[PDB]
Structure formats: C-alpha cells, structure tokens
Design a protein around this ligand. Structure first.
Ligand SMILES: Cc1ccc(CC(=O)NC[C@@H]2CCCO2)cc1
Ligand SMILES: [Zn+2]
Length: 140
C-alpha cells in the first residue's frame, strides 16, 4: 500500500483505489495502474520533473529503502500477479530489486522529488509507475 500526496491530489495504484478514491475521481488509466482522487487537506509530497535514472524506493516487504538504477518509462510486458493478469503496462520503469504485491504504492524518489510508485514485481525486478509526465499534478 502507499500514496503520493501532492497538493489536493492522492496518487495510488488503480488496483488499490478505494470506494472514496472512485467517488472523488480526478483521472485514472488501467494501462498505467494509476488513479488520482481529490483530497481536503493539502499534501507534503513534491513531484520530480526530470529524466533521472537513479533514485531510492521504499520496500515494505523488507522495511527498507534501496538505492536503484531504473529504465526510462516504457510500454512493458508484465507476468501475471495476484492483482492483474499477464499484460502490457505503459509508463513503466524497471529496476533490479525486491517487489511483492503488498509493496505497490511505495515511493521511488530522486534528487527532484517523487518519480513514481511501485506497481510490478517478481523475477527480482520492481516496476514503478512513473508520474513525472503527469504535468497537471503540479496545478489546480
Ligand atoms: C502524456 C499524458 C497523458 C495523460 C495525462 C493526464 C492528465 O493529467 N490529464 C487530465 C485528464 C485527462 C483527460 C481529461 O482530464 C497527462 C499527460
Ligand atoms: Zn530527478
């Protein structure tokens, strides 16, 4: 579990979105596994606007932050997980690290703020769902 809290927006894994998230929907994309909902209180997070390929992500299934190199956001094939089938997922970055289903929503950060959240795992990779292209997270 986990969420990016930027202005009056909450960014979660679409597959973990709550009834409240859907009741206060701003934007969703199943192909990216992202959903954005509106918040009453403002958020403590800043979004990275950058082409960084090195950062630190939180792994809940290890209680640990791990420094990682990660690929640029691409359309990638992703093997069947407990929360999705084997399928293509867009705007996805892969690093070499540990990711179990429960790890989804853990933050990846670089020197520029929040890059994205955990979304995929298995075979010793961790996929992150980039949010740097979502320019509208920083307005309105
Ligand atoms: C490349 C790219 C893709 C998607 C977005 C999402 C966004 O923030 N757009 C607000 C939504 C979209 C439909 C109407 O309102 C930004 C940039
Ligand atoms: Zn950066």
């Amino acid at each position: 579990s986990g969420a990016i809290y930027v202005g009056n927006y909450r960014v979660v894994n679409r597959h973990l979105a709550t009834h409240n998230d859907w009741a206060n929907l701003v934007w969703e994309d199943s192909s990216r596994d992202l959903l954005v909902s509106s918040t009453t209180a403002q958020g403590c997070d800043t979004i990275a606007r950058c082409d960084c390929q090195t950062g630190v992500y939180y792994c809940s299934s290890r209680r640990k932050h791990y420094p990682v190199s990660f690929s640029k956001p691409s359309l990638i094939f992703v093997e069947a997980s407990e929360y999705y089938p084997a399928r293509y997922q867009s705007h996805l970055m892969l690093a070499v690290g540990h990711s179990e289903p429960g790890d989804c929503g853990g933050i990846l950060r670089c020197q520029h703020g929040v890059v994205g959240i955990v979304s995929t795992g298995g075979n010793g990779l961790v996929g992150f769902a980039d949010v740097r292209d979502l320019l509208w997270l920083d307005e309105e």
